[PDB]
Each structure stands twice: as C-alpha cells, then as structure tokens.
Design a protein around this nucleic acid. Structure first.
Ligand code: MG
Ligand code: ZN
Ligand code: ZN
Ligand code: ZN
Lengths: 177, 112, 97, 171, 270, 551, 107, 84
DNA sequence: GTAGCTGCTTTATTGCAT
RNA sequence: CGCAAUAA
DNA sequence: CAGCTAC
C-alpha cells in the first residue's frame, strides 16, 4: 500500500464515509484543501486530460535522462513515440500507463505546453473547485447547457454567457489534429 | 529535612552491618519516595498506585483488579515502561535501546 | 530452564536490551498476530494466502498491521477480552508528550 | 478528475543492498510497487512524477536484522473515477447486456437498460452492436458516458455508466 | 519490591534521572553525574589539619625571604622574589584555597576528609612521577603563572552537564564544585613544586589525564540506575544475619513501609 | 517468528488503549452464534456442532478449517464468539463501581446529585484525574439522597434557581452477594435493584456526566459495566486435552461457559413459557452467578461453586493473578530455549572470564550462523561433520523457511551451503554466554564468559569469579544461556563480560578478588622468610603465560 | 498574617478566602516558637518568578507535572507562603559534590 | 521537531551502549552479507570486522539520541568520539 | 471504632493419586 | 491439576 | 496473621 501526508485520527468508530458524487463531494483524500510534502497547505491538484499527457510525457522522459546519467559509470505518430519512452522507463507490467497514454494521447484536446498554458490561465479565473476546472477543459462543449449539465456542480457559479465565452475561447485554443 | 532523616536511617541500617553502599543509591531510592509529595511507601499502597502506566503497575500485586479498572477508566498506556515492552516482546527503551540507529545514505557513498 | 523475574531485572540493569528481548521472544513465545488498525484487536480474519484481511464489525481489508509479541501476550489479552475488557493495540502514538 | 496527490511509502531494505547505489535501488523498487498499483482511496496509481527528487530521508534499522526501513516520500499522478462524473472513452466489448467503454486505465460498463430504448442490441452483427435510428455503436466507436457507480475491486476500479440523460451519445 | 519500585528509572541523554513519565527524580544522577565504578576514596587535605600547618603547606609569599618558594625548586626562582604582579595570583589562589577550607567544613561538619570522588588524583601523579624519572633535586621550569593558570583551565573542561545556557551552565559548576576543591587541593603551587617536583612536561601530562579520565567517569545516558541502585540496597540486605533500637532487616522493612508505630521511637535532643 | 509470509505491513505496539466491550461490538467481532451448550459430537460422530467449539471459532483435530481462514492450529490465533444472555448481569469486578455510581446519580432521571451550582462539587469537577475526580465526586454526593429541582445560586440564598426536575428520594445502597439493595427513607422501604433497572438508569446518564465521573464516551461508558452480550473465548484460551481419539479433555473454562449457557437457556424458556413471575428471578440469580464465577471465583460471599470433585474451578481472574500466572508468571519471566544447567566446580586453570562447558552440552546447544564467504567452508565442515563428533552442527536451514535435520536427512554427508543459508552449529570455544547462579539479586549474578568445551559433566568456572555469584561447590548448580543473534552476544560480550563487572558500581570497589588456596598461598609465598631456588623460580616463571622470558 | 494563640473559630476562619486579590494566612503562636528553617536538617529554599519558573521549565524541556513537588501545607511551604503553582529552588549540601540544585513546584 | 546539528548538548562521546550496540548491529548486517567498508586483512568474523569498521570510523550509521520530551539529536559514528 | 483486603525469596529435583 | 517431600 | 485503608 501507500500513505498520504494527512494523518487523520481513527477514533474506533469507522463510520462517516459519505459517498462520491460530482457534488464536489470527493472522498476526504481529495478536499480542495490538501497537504503538501513541505507540510504546506496546497490547493487540490486537478489535472485535465491532455494537460496530463504532458505532465506524464515530460516526467516520463526526464526520467529516461537520469536513467542514463548513470550508464557511463502528430496523433498516431505519438502512439509510436510513446510506446518507446514507455518500454524504456516504465515497467511493462504497468499495462495501465500504457493504456493511459493511449487514451490520454488520443482524446487529448491539445498539443502545446503553451496552448495548454493559456487554457489553464483562462479557466483559472473563475473560482471553480479544481475538479470543475479540469472538466470544462477536457470536455468538448457547445451551449452553456452542455456544460452546466455534464458538469452539474457549476449551475450557479457562472452566467451562461460567461461560461459561453469561456466555452468559445476553448473551441479555439483547441489545437487542431 | 524529612528526606535527610529517611536517608539518614536507611543509611544507618546498611551501615550497622559494616557493608558499604554508595550514597547515590540509597539517595535515589530515598528520593523516589520523597519527590511526589511526602512519603510514598515502596508498597502497593504507595508508588504502585500513581499515574504510571497500567500494564506496568499491573505486573505487581493487584494485577487483575488494576487491569479491570484500566478499561473501566479508559486508561492509556505509553508503553514507555520497562515492563511494558517486556510483556509485548519489544526492545525496551533501556541502555542498548534508549536511542536509534540509521544508515545515513550520504556517508554510505563517501565510504568507497 | 527458566529466565524468571530475577533474571530479567539483572539484564535490565545491564542495559542488555536486545538480549533481554531475545530471551523473552525467540527463545520462547514469539508469535505473529494481526490487528484492526482502528479498534486495537485480534479479530482480523487474515487468510495469509489470498492476502484478504477483513475484520467486519469494524469492516476493513485495508488498515491492517501484523505484530510480533509473546504468545503469552495474545493470551493475556484474549483472556481480558473474555472478561470483557478492551486491550487496544495501536501501531502509532497520538496522545504524544 | 486526474489528480496529483502527495504520498509516502515505507519499504524495508535488506542489509544486502546497503551499497553505494542504494538510493537508487530504493527508488527503483518504490516504482516496482507503486506505479501500476490501485487502491480504493487513491485509485489508479499511474506515474511517479519528478524522479530525481524523491525523498528517502535517513532510514532506521529494524533491530533483529539489519533491514532498514526508509519512508519514501513522493508525488505521483492518479485518477479514480467518481459517481456522477462524466468522461468519454473508446468502447471495447459488447453484448446483449450492454457495452463496455474504456475510459483511461479504467473500464466503465453500460447496461442495455441504462441506454435509450430506440437503441436495440443487434445480434447478427459482426462485430456485435447496438443501433439507433441514425446511430451505430460498436468497438472503436467513441462514446461519452456518465459514471453512475463505482466498485473498488482487487487492484482495478470498475463502474457503470448511463447514456440516457441528454448530451451522452456517440461523437 | 525495591525492584518494581525503581525499574523504569534511568539516566536520560540530558543527564537527568527519570522514569516512564519523564518525572525528574534527580537532575544530575547522584548529584554529580558520575558512574559509581569510577570513584575511589580520596582525601580533601584542604580540610583537616591545624590552621598553622595549613598555611605552611599551601602558602606562597613572593614578598618574603622565609615564605617565598626557595629558588632550589622553581627554575625561575630568584627572578621571581618580590614580583608583585605574580603575588596577585598567589594571593588570589591562596584566598581560594581558604574559601575551600571553610566550604568543606561547612558540608562535612564532621571533619571526615576521605570521600568517594571521580578521578584518582593521588595515583595519577605517582604515575607521572616515575614516567618522567623526575628527580627530587633539580629545579622545575613551570612559571608560577604556568601552574596556577593551567589548573584554572583544567576545571573549565571537566564537563558533566554540557548545556549552552545559564541555568544549565550553572548546574555544571554545582555538580562539580566538590571535585574541584580536591583538585585545587592537590594542585596548589607549593604542593606541586615542593612535594611532587614536576617538570613543565609532567604537569601538562597530569593535567591532561585528570581531564580525559574525568570525562570517562561521567555516567552514560542509558544506565538503568534505578534497578542498579535498587539492587545495591536489597543485596547487602540478604547478607544480613542477625544501642537497643529496632535495627537490621526488620528496621529497613519498617522504613520502606512508612509504618506509623515503629517499635522503637527514640528522639535525640541536643 | 510464526512462519508463513504475511503481505500485511509490520509495526510494533506503541499505545495500549484500555476500555470496555460494547454489547454490539461483541456481536460485530463474533464469528459464532454459540447457542448449544454441548461441546459437539454431531450425534456422537466425532467433530463439532455449530453450538460451542468451532461453531466457526478456531479448531482442533489438526485441520486447516477455521472458516476458510485455514492456517490450522499454529498460526490461527483465536476466533471470538459470543452468547446472548436473557437478562442483564453485573461484572463480578465492576459490581464494586456500578454501586458507587448509582449513589452519585439519580434513578428516574439519570443526572448528578451535585451541579456546578454547589461549590464543594465544582472543586471536584476541577481536579483533573479520572480517578481522584470520581473519588471526590462520590465522597460528596453519596450523602444527598434527594434529586432536587431547585437550589440557591451563586447570588442570594433568597433566590432558589432551577435545573433538572424529579426530586424523588434516593435509597442508600448496600451490597448483598451479587445484588444491590437500598432503603428509601416513616419506616424503611427496602427493595432489590434489578439489573435491567440499573442498566437503564445508567444508559440515561449524561454524556458529559460520564466524563465528570472517570469514564469515556467511546471506550468505557458506565452503561457497559453491566454485561448484555458475552464474549466467548475460542479454543486456544480454553484448549482441550484429547487422549488419542475417543477420549475427552475439555478445559476448565469450557465448562463454566457450558454452565453459563445452560443456566441462560433455562431463563429464556421461562419467559416465553410458564412464567411463575418471581420463581424466575429465582433462576436469573443463577446466571448472575455462573457469569460472575466464569471471571472471578475468590469472592467474600463464600460459595466457591466447586466443579463436581470439590475442585475450585479457575476463574479467568485466577489465570492472571500474580506469580505463576500469565503476567508475573508467563510474561515477566518465561522458560527459555538454548539453556543448560549442571553442577559447578572450581578450577584454577581458566582465566576469570572463562567457563568450562561439558562436551555433552556443547553438542546439545547450538548457535545459528549465516553462511558467509567468510566461513562457507568452516560450516560445510561442521555440517558434514555430523552432530555427534564435537566440533559439528545439527541443523541447516535454507532460505525457503525449511529445516534440514542434519542427523537423519538422507543427505547428511551432502549439502552445498548457500550464501544466506543458516547453519545451526555446536557451541564452540569462545562463544559468549550468559552464565549465572540464582537467586539473581546482583547485577553481577549473571555474566558473560568465554565458552570452553571440556570433558566431564560440569560447568567449571574460575574461583575468583565465585564470590560474585555467591556460589561454592557443596552441590550447587548454575544456569547457562546461549545468545542467538549476532547483535545479541555483542551485548553480552560488551557489557556483560566478566572482565567488566570487576569493579562494583554499588560499592565503588572491585567485587571479585583472590580467595581460598591462592589467597592463603600468596601470603606464605610473600614472607621475608620465604625463598625459592633456581629449578622452581624457573618453572614458576614458565607458568606465567606472559613471561617476557627474562629470568 | 494572623498569629492566633490557642485557636480560631470554625465560624471565624470561614471568611479568610472571601476577599481576593489579597490573601490571608493563619499561624499558631506555639507553632512559631522556633524557626524550622533554622534546623540543621533543613536546607534553605527560594521562590521563583513566573519568569524564573517558566524558564527552569523550558530549560529542562519539562511539563509542569514532571516536576518534584512540595506539600501546600509543608512546614517550609507556609514559611514562604507558596501558591498552587509557584516553584521553589532548594540548594543543599552534598557528599558527592558541594551543592545540588533541586526544585519543587507546589500542589 | 528535530534539532539542528548545531545546538546539541548530549555527550560528544559514545555511550558504552551505543558503541556496544553499533558494533552488534553492524556485525549483524555484515554477517548478512552487507557491504564491507574496510580491508578485511584476513579477518573473517563480523563482530571482529565491526570493531574494525568502527575503529577507522568507516561505519555509515547514525545514532538518534532521544530526549525525555520527544525531541532528539543526531550523531554519526564518524562524529562521536570513541574513548571508552 | 470495626470490618474488609492482599501478599508470603529464587530456581531444581523427585515421588506421589484421581 | 493439588499434595508431599528434597537440594542450595 | 499483620499493616493498612474503607465503612
Ligand atoms: Mg552453596
Ligand atoms: Zn476491527
Ligand atoms: Zn482461523
Ligand atoms: Zn432524578
């Protein structure tokens, strides 16, 4: 198993375990208020597809680098470029991350660490409890309704027109393929 | 001044016999009894009823009774006591185990 | 042979920690039991084969530690339980100090 | 939806590996156990970010046999679905009871009952399928579902999703 | 009983004596922080003896032809006589050796001068003696300033409690104090040069050892004193096979119990 | 040490939380209902009935089963069960307190008889100490027997302020056997306080009132001192003793429960059947008995409830009672392995720290050494050497937690050792050992000696090391303990080695010295009058091992 | 302070703690014929400021309890008139090293 | 908390237990085929080796001195003076 | 002023009986 | 299991 | 049978 910087004290009675509903009722282990290694308080880290593909790709690569500093002593085109970085710095028995990079690489809504840069700076100016932010990002939407429905937590956190503009700005930055 | 006498006596006792004991000991004991407040008998009536752990006081005279009212008063034991670990099978925080040991990765490379 | 109290005392005086613990354990009882990380108990229906761990009533399969203590210990406890007293076993202190 | 949670892990190392390239074997094994894991409270553990700055701190020695216990503090990326969570993925298998769509490392399944009625299960189809008046759903066909419920099993989380509400079909 | 009564009492790394509650029982184990095994009966000469004889022995007068160190002892003998800046230390010293006299006679009302004390300063010298084949004839080579100062230094190092603040450092002085007297007793200018002729070398050696040997005689945080001391008493308690006052085994019992009506009551009024 | 790899993590106990069982937790935990009294015999058919004994609990007959939990016998700790009493019964040991509590709270309502309104009471509610608080509390409100509704506040004795109601009088309670009775006071009105009644009054006691009176909201609720559900310890706490096959062996406790059970069933079959009302309370007092005894059988109200044979019956309390019992008996001091004992006899030929161990024993005791390229040879020799020649060994254990028995294994003269393998070998000369002579009342009672294998059956220790053991040879014996882990011996050899104990930290003086012969002789050898000539002064020099070779 | 001769009334005394801040003590005449402090056996003690005390404490990494105590009615205790909290430093002689610093909080 | 490698008060020398233990601990590991940090000049005994590793202060271990309050200090075999 | 309570040195060795 | 011995 | 707390 594995632990987490968050020593919740067990008082014999193991009962209060809510339920998970996209009513921003994420299991305690994901409050918009979690603890950083430095013992610091840090906002929940919601990662939206494609913005994830980069986080992985990058760290997954840079690993390959320090995995060799110790050796002296295009859509379907990235499918192949990833199978590489994988069968080099992964385990291979981690068949998931293989599947995750597939899905992640495929349904990605971007490409640039710049595009995904402004994407973030954009959504990041609402006050939306990180899980929303991520959703509005990795989900293709048209009306403010498609959103307010597939992302029910919203509802009263923005005037349709706004979430509309923001929804438009997305159908743009949204790099081609 | 009480201590003084308590010690004075304990001393004169081991002394009338000829035998020699070094202050420190009788002193320590004479103290253990003295600190707390007044006189604390080295008996189930005295010391073995003070705020020490439960399991400890448990291994001496009142045992079961002591235990019974341990869970009765939801007591908590530090397992700081000698006896404590002994009962548990762990290294007691005593001499050899009054501290920890660690492989310091660093020095473990500076050495080669 | 027996390593009764008298003998213990001596070792505790010597400071021979490990050794003492070793006489008490390896050369005697020494048993490995499981616990509900929550209600400090023996319950844990451990199947050390399929890994499954449960402890329903507390309902788990997640927070479970295994500990090494004397068989005369598991016993001391079970006996207290049969007399209806909860001897909780916690793998980490909280009360601090 | 996908998160980056800060975890730790206590691995016991045998005195054997108390070499110079220890810091390494610690890491190395961390990954052998973490990456690819799965818990109901952390969900799917996918990747350890920032390889070079993993904290090992001073590990202590377990009295009775050298074995040192280090508390590897770290950070990685994960994803564990939720109920009422909407995500889309590639369909995989399909049957008279529904079809299963693969959202990431996970797999969500849809019941013949959780979809619309004007969608029937085509039997004599190859490969198997479901058909609407204007639609056709099978294998590589991309859907977008609503995760109704989750069930954390072994080392793999599963869920059931519906495509009955609005805006939840093919694409 | 004494066992279970003091099991958990051990010396902590701070040099304090406590139990399973951290309850201080003795801030410095044995009011001195020394390991029993490193102690031998020494004698504080600076205490017993006539007022006359005392002065004789430890008094140094660089302003007198009959009370000055005869130049046959110190090498810089004659060139010292009269030296007023030196007689300031010689009087600064002799004044101390007397605060000592009064001090000891204020703790040991008795007059008993033989007590258990770490570091055998007695032998430590004897060794130095025949280790440098020093002859009771030739002159020294120690400035009066050499001696009196190196002594004042020796002290500074006999660290029992280490601490970095006031309170603590204060304890240091406390915990040591007595040993010192003994030290200043066996290391007075006269004694050093007249009684045991020491070269500058011999001295620097004796000094060094007194230290390093002292620092060994400290207690080791980890010593389960309680149990130790516990046994140390109930040991010669078994060897008891038995002025007409309740004494011996029953007596001890009577005590450890905190019993009301003790067989013998007595009460000595002076 | 318990065999079988456990994937679960591994920690050491840090805290011990003492509490009382909730009549529901008991259920939660329980894996067996336990309704039948009988041991089993599914119609004499040897096995077990879902009644008592493995109605799922642990098992016997060397059979894995244990509700799939497998493991069988060694490895499967106990599996608790329970049993539903008909009516509430006290707790033989808590009776003392359940009483003292009622005198502090009122029946009918359930609140204290002393509010922060009374001042002597406040001071009590201030004394932080779960025991001393509940000590003073009781001392105070055991007097007032009127659960008042109004009292003169912290203002004027002219303005009687209000609080909880019901001022009903409270009976002074007294103990009788296993029940509480109290008079309500023209003239007395004595009545028996029914457990069902007390139980309730307690349940309705304030949550913050619990607290004030040395109790805990989560671990020890007063309302728990009264037993509803009964935890039924599994086999290994009350093991059988089956003689071969068709013979019994049931433990003492296993009967007490059996009793408790029977006595219980009788009650229920009277409450849902011919219930002569108070001819039933005449049988409810029986359950309060057995379940009293099952835990404690050394009360004041004599009736010992002897098992048919006038034999007492060991209550659980009796199993823990000091000396010879679990705590002081099996935990504070156990019997050990790797230990020997014989007759000690002096010998002026072994340096202080040595200790002669008879070859007989060097072959009995062993030391587990780990195959290392530093001795991969020395061991293969011992291993093949067999366990009969002296320098040998008797066991080789491989990584695969399996032991080869060097004296039968059709491979004795074989075996290629594997780096990491453990080869238990014979004690050889110079293995540190803890050698001592009881009664051990000195730190010096036990010490570490260098082992020296020697013929003839006796521990042959040096003389000078004799007075610290308080020993002599008028037929005295001694104990010898063989260390086991590398780090172990290290502790003996570095802190326990005889050469160390030489100066006693209880008299700041040596505790060993020269005695007897060597003493009496070192005097005659001294004397001005004593002279020795060449031949001798030569042999004598030779005897001193460290002779510089300079006549 | 109030030096009663043979006694005070159980009615009287019941008004000593009724006017705080200010506090009052009662001493028997005969009980003060000789000073106990003067006794060969008794070492002089001393009070501590809420500074010196809060110091001592922090300097030994101690909690309040862990400290050795002296009875509220202890002979010496009243001589200096302590308070459930104040600390006394006892400096006495020692056959192991001249002096020895020891403290006693008051209960 | 912890405590800075500076400001520590504990004895600069190794307790007889620390040493006694250190050796044991190391020996134990040595005996378990751990890495050897000195030239086993013929030496084939662990606790023998340890005494050697420890005399060239080439032991990679750290003693964690705890205090009656919980706070602790950290010393390395290297640092600690081995007088005894 | 009367009543109720808990402990008794350490190991070991043997006979015993139901 | 309880008794009785007996060693030092 | 104390020696001492509890009633
Ligand atoms: Mg004898
Ligand atoms: Zn549980
Ligand atoms: Zn089982
Ligand atoms: Zn009421």
């Amino acid at each position: 198993s594995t632990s987490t910087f968050q020593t919740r004290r067990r008082r014999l009675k193991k009962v209060e375990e809510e339920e998970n509903a996209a009513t921003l009722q994420l299991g305690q282990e994901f409050q918009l208020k979690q603890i950083n290694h430095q013992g610091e308080e840090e906002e929940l880290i919601a990662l939206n597809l494609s913005e994830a593909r980069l986080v992985i790709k990058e760290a997954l690569v840079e690993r390959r680098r320090a995995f060799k500093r110790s050796q002296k002593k295009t859509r379907e085109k990235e499918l192949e470029s990833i199978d590489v970085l994988l069968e080099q710095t992964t385990g291979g028995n981690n068949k998931d991350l293989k599947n995750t990079m597939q899905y992640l690489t495929n349904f990605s809504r971007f490409r640039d660490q710049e595009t995904v840069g402004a994407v973030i700076q954009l959504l990041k100016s609402t006050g939306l409890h990180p899980f929303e932010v991520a959703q509005l990002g990795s989900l293709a939407c048209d009306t403010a309704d498609e959103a307010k429905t597939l992302i029910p937590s919203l509802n009263n956190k923005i005037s349709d027109d706004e979430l509309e503009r923001i929804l438009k700005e997305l159908s743009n930055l949204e790099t081609l393929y | 001044a009480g201590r003084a006498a308590l010690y004075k006596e304990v001393y004169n006792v081991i002394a009338s016999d000829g035998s020699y004991v070094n202050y420190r000991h009788m002193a320590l004991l004479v103290d253990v009894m003295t600190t707390q407040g007044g006189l604390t008998s080295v008996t189930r009536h005295g010391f073995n009823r003070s705020n020490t752990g439960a399991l400890m006081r448990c291994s001496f005279e009142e045992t079961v009774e002591i235990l019974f009212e341990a869970g009765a008063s939801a007591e908590l034991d530090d397992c700081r006591g000698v006896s404590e670990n002994v009962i548990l099978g762990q290294m007691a925080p005593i001499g050899t185990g009054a501290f920890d040991v660690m492989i310091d990765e660093e020095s473990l490379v500076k050495y080669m | 042979l027996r390593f009764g109290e008298m003998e213990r005392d001596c070792m505790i005086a010597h400071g021979a920690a490990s050794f003492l613990k070793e006489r008490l354990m390896e050369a005697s009882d020494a048993f490995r039991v499981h616990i509900c990380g929550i209600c400090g108990l023996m319950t844990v229906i451990a199947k050390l084969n399929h890994n499954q761990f449960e402890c329903k009533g507390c309902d788990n399969k997640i927070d479970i530690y295994q500990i090494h203590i004397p068989y005369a210990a598991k016993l001391l406890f079970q006996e207290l339980m049969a007399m209806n007293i909860t001897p909780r076993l916690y793998t980490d202190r909280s009360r601090d100090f | 939806m996908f998160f980056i949670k800060d975890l730790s892990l206590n691995i016991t190392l045998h005195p054997s590996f108390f070499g110079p390239r220890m810091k390494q074997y610690l890491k190395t094994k961390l990954l052998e156990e973490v990456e690819g894991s799965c818990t109901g409270k952390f969900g799917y553990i996918l990747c350890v970010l920032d390889y070079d700055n993993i904290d090992i701190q001073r590990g202590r020695i377990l009295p009775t046999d050298g074995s040192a216990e280090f508390n590897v503090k770290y950070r990685a990326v994960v994803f564990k679905p939720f109920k009422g969570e909407v995500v889309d993925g590639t369909v995989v298998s399909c049957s008279q009871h529904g079809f299963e769509v693969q959202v990431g490392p996970m797999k969500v399944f849809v019941t013949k009952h959780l979809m619309p009625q004007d969608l029937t299960f085509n039997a004599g189809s190859n490969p198997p399928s479901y058909q609407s008046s204007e639609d056709v759903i099978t294998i590589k066909s991309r859907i977008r579902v609503k995760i109704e419920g989750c069930i954390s099993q072994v080392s793999s989380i599963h869920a059931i999703g519906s495509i009955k509400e609005d805006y939840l079909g093919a694409i | 009983r004494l066992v279970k009564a003091l099991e958990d009492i051990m010396v902590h790394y701070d040099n304090t004596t406590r139990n399973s509650l951290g309850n201080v029982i003795q801030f410095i184990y044995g009011e001195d922080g020394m390991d029993a095994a490193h102690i031998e009966k020494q004698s504080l000469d600076t205490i017993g003896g006539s007022d006359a004889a005392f002065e004789k022995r430890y008094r140094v007068d660089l302003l007198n032809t009959d009370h000055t160190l005869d130049p046959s002892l110190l090498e810089s003998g004659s060139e010292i006589l009269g030296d007023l800046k030196l007689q300031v230390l010689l009087d600064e010293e002799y004044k101390q050796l007397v605060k000592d006299r009064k001090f000891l006679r204020e703790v040991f009302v008795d007059g008993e001068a033989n007590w258990p004390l770490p570091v055998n300063i007695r032998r430590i010298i004897q060794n130095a003696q025949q280790t440098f084949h020093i002859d009771h004839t030739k002159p020294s080579d120690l400035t009066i300033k050499d001696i009196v100062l190196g002594v004042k230094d020796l002290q500074e190092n006999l660290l029992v409690l280490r601490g970095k603040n006031e309170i603590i450092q204060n304890a240091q002085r406390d915990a040591v104090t007595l040993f010192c007297c003994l030290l200043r007793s066996r290391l007075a200018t006269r004694r050093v040069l007249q009684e045991y002729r020491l070269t500058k070398q011999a001295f620097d050696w004796v000094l060094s050892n007194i230290e390093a040997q002292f620092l060994r005689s400290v207690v080791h945080p980890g010593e389960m004193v309680g149990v130790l001391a516990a046994q140390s008493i109930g040991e010669p308690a078994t060897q008891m096979t038995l002025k007409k006052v309740t004494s011996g085994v029953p007596r001890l019992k009577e005590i450890l119990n905190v019993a009301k009506n003790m067989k013998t009551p007595s009460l000595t009024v002076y | 040490v318990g065999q079988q790899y456990s994937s679960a993590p591994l920690r050491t106990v840090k805290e011990v939380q003492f509490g009382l069982f909730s009549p529901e937790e008991v259920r939660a935990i329980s894996v067996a209902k336990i309704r039948f009294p009988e041991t089993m015999d599914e119609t004499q058919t040897r096995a077990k009935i879902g009644g008592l004994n493995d109605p799922r609990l642990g098992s016997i007959d060397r059979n894995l089963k244990c509700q799939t939990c497998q493991e069988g016998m060694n490895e499967c700790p106990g599996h608790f069960g329970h049993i539903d009493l008909a009516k509430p019964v006290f707790h033989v040991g808590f009776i003392a307190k359940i009483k003292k509590v009622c005198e502090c709270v009122c029946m009918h309502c359930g609140k204290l008889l002393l509010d922060e309104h009374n001042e002597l009471m406040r001071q009590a509610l201030a004394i932080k100490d779960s025991k001393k608080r509940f000590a003073a509390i009781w001392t105070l409100c055991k007097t007032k027997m009127v659960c008042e509704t109004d009292v003169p506040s912290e203002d004027d004795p002219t303005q009687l302020v209000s609080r909880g109601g019901c001022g009903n009088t409270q009976p002074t309670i007294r103990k009788d056997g296993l029940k509480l009775v109290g008079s309500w006071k023209d003239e007395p009105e004595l009545r028996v306080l029914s457990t069902e009644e007390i139980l309730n009054i307690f349940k309705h006691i304030s949550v913050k009132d619990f607290t004030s009176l040395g109790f805990n909201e989560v671990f020890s609720r007063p309302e728990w001192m009264i037993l509803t559900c009964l935890p039924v310890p599994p086999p290994p706490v009350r093991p059988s003793i089956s003689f071969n096959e068709s013979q019994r062996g049931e433990d003492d406790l296993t009967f007490k429960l059996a009793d408790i059970l029977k006595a219980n069933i009788s009650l229920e079959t009277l409450e849902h059947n011919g219930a002569p009302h108070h001819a039933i309370e005449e049988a409810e007092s029986l359950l309060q008995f057995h379940v009293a005894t099952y835990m404690d059988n050394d009360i004041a109200g004599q009736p010992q409830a002897l098992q048919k044979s006038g034999r007492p019956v060991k209550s659980i309390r009796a199993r823990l009672k000091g000396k010879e019992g679990r705590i002081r008996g099996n935990l504070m001091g156990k019997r050990v392995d790797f230990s020997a004992r014989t007759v000690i006899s002096g010998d002026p030929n072994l340096e202080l720290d040595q200790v002669g161990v008879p070859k007989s024993i060097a072959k009995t005791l062993t030391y587990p050494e780990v195959v290392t390229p530093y001795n991969i040879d020395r061991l293969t020799q011992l291993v093949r050497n067999g366990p009969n020649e002296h320098p040998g060994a008797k066991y080789v254990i491989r990584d695969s937690g399996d032991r080869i028995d060097l004296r039968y294994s059709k491979r004795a003269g074989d075996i290629q050792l594997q780096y990491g393998w453990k080869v238990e070998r014979h004690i050889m000369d110079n293995d540190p050992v803890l050698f001592n002579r009881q009664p051990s009342l000195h730190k010096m009672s036990m010490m570490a000696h260098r082992v020296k294998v020697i013929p003839y059956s006796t521990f042959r220790l040096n003389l000078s090391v004799t007075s610290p053991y308080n020993a002599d040879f008028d037929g005295d014996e001694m104990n010898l303990h063989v260390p086991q882990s590398e780090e172990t011996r290290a502790e003996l050899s570095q802190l326990c080695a005889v050469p160390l104990q030489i100066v006693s930290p209880q008299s700041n003086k040596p505790c060993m010295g020269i005695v007897q012969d060597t003493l009496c002789g070192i005097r005659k050898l001294t004397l001005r009058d004593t002279f020795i000539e060449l031949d001798q002064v030569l042999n004598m020099l030779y005897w001193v091992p460290d002779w510089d070779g300079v006549i | 302070i109030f030096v009663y001769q043979n006694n005070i009334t159980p009615s009287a005394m019941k008004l000593v703690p009724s006017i705080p801040p200010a506090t009052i003590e009662t001493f028997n005449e005969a009980a003060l014929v000789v000073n106990i402090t003067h006794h060969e056996l008794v070492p002089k003690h001393i009070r501590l400021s809420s500074d010196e005390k809060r110091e001592l404490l922090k300097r030994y990494r101690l909690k309040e309890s862990q400290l050795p105590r002296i009875q509220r009615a202890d002979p010496v205790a009243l001589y200096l008139g302590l308070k459930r909290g104040e600390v006394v430093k006892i400096i006495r002689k020692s056959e192991t090293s001249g002096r020895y610093a020891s403290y006693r909080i008051c209960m | 908390k912890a405590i800075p490698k500076d400001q520590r008060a504990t004895t600069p020398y190794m307790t007889k237990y620390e040493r006694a233990r250190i050796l044991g601990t190391r020996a134990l590991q040595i005996s378990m085929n751990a890495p050897v940090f000195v030239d086993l000049e013929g030496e084939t005994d662990p606790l023998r080796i340890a005494m050697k590793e420890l005399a060239e202060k080439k032991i990679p271990l750290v003693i964690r001195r705890y205090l009656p309050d919980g706070s602790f200090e950290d010393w390395s075999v290297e640092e600690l003076i081995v007088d005894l």
